[PDB]
């Protein structure tokens, strides 16, 4: 099913500078019992970041069985708790700091990664979709459309049914989406099941740092206004959409009001959201909705409120 309400469960992509790194020290998968809390809160879809270099420490070669087995176990526990998972290659269109499409990371190497991801997990009932790359940016922007096509071709060799979540240039900015997304119109999916996925924060520079508070003259519809360029481009071109990353601090009611207004707008257009972020090792991270003693998480009640209003059967907009 297409749930409008989902969460990011981050941690497996942490500490990108430590490769391969050590599980429990540099990166973190959900412990056993982790998904139980979110299942009882009525959350049934999870977006799960992964690091390409840990999945595949050598281009064009087999996946690392140790890290991939941690993914196996995660998907099993999601199935235990009635959760479907979006796998997210959280790599900014780069492998070991080099852009997909340059000499050292040819698009064929990216295609090989996605072939291997799809081959290993297409048979897993808990797998919902592939977010084939998180936030292309910078020098990756011009090369990203060609990379995306190779990623699509790779998955479709082994999985011809699941949705493919296609992010855009410029950190997949929702507010800036129409400036660059026309180049994504050339993408071809034999299965005709692509969904575009933009990201939005409502701080000053949309970086999600929230260095400052809402400030005076704060516009509660700011979240709606920053996703309107994305949703209107989807309507103009007859495409389907998704918001794969959005989060707010827990310390100002004005943030919550804007998140309510955003979720209402997304509901009216059948656009799913993945809140950024839950996860087992976030510590004091200001956007975390993971339960923490000496923290309250008023974003969760808002998510649950709109999960009960979800009467969409497919990705919108209409
Ligand atoms: O949006 C999350 C993403 O933002 C990056 O900051 C961008 C920002 O998105 C953009 O709106 C602004 O104009 O430029 C900055 C970059 O200088 C940030 O670098 C990422 O870590 C983050 O994932």
Numbering used by the authors: 1 to 318
Paper text:
RBcel1, an endoglucanase of the GH5_5 subfamily isolated from an uncultured bacterium, has aroused interest because of its ability to polymerize cellooligosaccharides in vitro under near-physiological conditions. After the glycosylation step, the donor sugar is covalently bound to the enzyme within its negatively numbered subsites. Transglycosylation occurs when a sugar hydroxyl group is used as an acceptor instead of a water molecule during the deglycosylation step. Solving the structures of two RBcel1 variants, RBcel1_E135Q and RBcel1_Y201F, in complex with ligands has brought to light some of the molecular factors behind transglycosylation.
